[PDB]
Symmetry: C3
């Protein structure tokens, strides 16, 4: 009916869905790269301006499927002698093969959880907005994210499998690591 | 009345409009600034014309970061952040994949002026790499676009060229205070 | 009732709220760094105060890329991607033009915390080049902003200065866990 149609349209516009994924640097992509553009003898020291292009692998929440990759850049903002607390400003995207991609913008802080802006998406993520929660499991090679996505159609079930709880021992299945056809997104990004 | 008002408001929030433009590198702005390994940065700025190729609208401006090389496809993946400037109309910002060997879809992160508050996607179609590109924007949540921006689109092809007056920025063939 | 519930939902989705802030470079963050004409990259981070200049909120952080020089107007055009951090309130991200010789409008790409799900535009006004700026955000789609962030705005001018308490980050004059 009229009020149902309207209600449903509004539900979608305001509706939020969660999506968890794992980001893993398997050290096989030459990433990350350090552009030490910021200011002992023949030794690098972090400073504002250092740029860090990067690209890592993306697996689903259940860790049984290779989905794609992250791709983008971080800029070093502040730092000191402590491991914890260095701040980067980042802009990058998550690629999910034929499903589409999600773009993000926001803080990356060494040894701290942060929240990033979801600037939008394509494919099944087209027109989304919201936030991504970034949790570091093993700094800096293993991360976990939960996206909170507003404004899109119900996510397909293969992206909503039971999530493995994030811990240092959490590992992709052997079949996913090897990119077996039964364990990848349609034309998974690589 | 009451349900009319609410419906219309929802109609705007949900509505999507197409907008097509041409991006052309005319070899005059010293763009881009450059291809191998990974992590290379490429700032750039090209000219933007309307879908009908009769009006010079502004420019693109932003950066691409090289991500990987593909030997089989003989191409490179970049991650891009840049904006389309339309003179006094405002601008549209995008973020996402820029890949030398194929078309891609980018995120429309928002806009200003008549594009204020928009969101959606931009389809990037390569005609001749890297000098001639054709984009179709799918823009959600803004008011009806002005007619000047919705003229019959010339189908993308190698013969597609801006009119002489657009190329020379003739007052009859530019956006108000077109971006340069 | 039903259509009241629906009405209030639409109201939020469509509603727009203003938020003004001051950005100030106090020369204590090693900002900015200039890295080479088109292509020059500039990382930066300055301090952010509230519209009333009585409260230190946080910082800005991001990068600008130099696009072009305008000999006539004696200025440069940059393309920027950066964020405003408001301590525990969350943050706002932006993308768009920064031009040394004139005011511009940027895209609000979104936000976190209380700003979660916002979209809109930010109006950038340069007071003192380049160490003091004034912004007004026009934020769509989020719940009512807290009063701390909505105090009476001091009209921007070169003499506009933050209070002694806010400058010294006194607990009475900071956002909760203000970003630093
Ligand atoms: C938000 C980006 C997602 C993961 C982090 C991305 O991989 C980039 C890390 C960026 C900054 C951290 C700086 C430490 C980099 C040291 C790398 C050492 C190594 O090669 O393992
Ligand atoms: C266009 C900005 C995005 C990506 C650039 C990508 O690195 C590729 C560009 C390569 C060459 C630019 C060629 C166009 C310049 C016109 C001068 C003609 C010429 O010398 O070939
Ligand atoms: C959107 C820009 C926001 C804040 C401005 C940011 O600091 C960047 C200004 C851009 C260009 C100025 C380039 C020359 C500045 C050198 C002087 C810096 C200083 O006084 O510490």
């Amino acid at each position: 009916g009229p009020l149902g149609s309207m209600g449903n349209k509004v539900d979608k516009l305001a509706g939020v869905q969660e999506l968890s994924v794992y980001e893993i640097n398997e050290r096989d992509r030459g990433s990350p790269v350090i552009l030490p553009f910021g200011g002992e003898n023949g030794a690098h020291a972090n400073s504002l301006g250092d740029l860090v292009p990067f690209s890592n692998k993306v697996y689903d929440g259940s860790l049984q499927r290779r989905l794609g990759i992250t791709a983008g850049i971080c800029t070093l903002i502040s730092h000191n002698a402590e491991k914890k607390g260095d701040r980067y400003e980042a802009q990058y995207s998550f690629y999910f093969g034929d499903y589409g991609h999600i773009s993000v913008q926001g803080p990356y802080i060494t040894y701290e959880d942060t929240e990033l802006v979801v600037t939008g998406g394509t494919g099944i993520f087209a027109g989304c907005h919201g936030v991504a929660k970034l949790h570091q499991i093993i700094f800096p090679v293993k991360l976990f994210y939960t996206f909170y996505l507003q404004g899109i159609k119900k996510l397909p079930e293969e992206l909503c499998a039971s999530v493995v709880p994030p811990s240092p021992s959490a590992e992709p299945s052997e079949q996913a690591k090897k990119c077996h056809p039964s364990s990848v997104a349609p034309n998974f990004t690589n």
